[PDB]
Design a binder for this molecule. Sequence first.
Ligand SMILES: [Zn+2]
Length: 46
Amino acid sequence: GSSGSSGTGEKPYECSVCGKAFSHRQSLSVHQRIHSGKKPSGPSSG
Ligand SMILES: [Zn+2]
């Protein structure tokens, strides 16, 4: 078939917890930080 895209972004470093991409590993680490104690069980509770 035909799609029209040969993945022009894929990188050796891509986050999973949130699903992001980066060029260097160091850039991926500092990013994962955003996922620090920021995962509440429920959005609207209590
Ligand atoms: Zn992430």
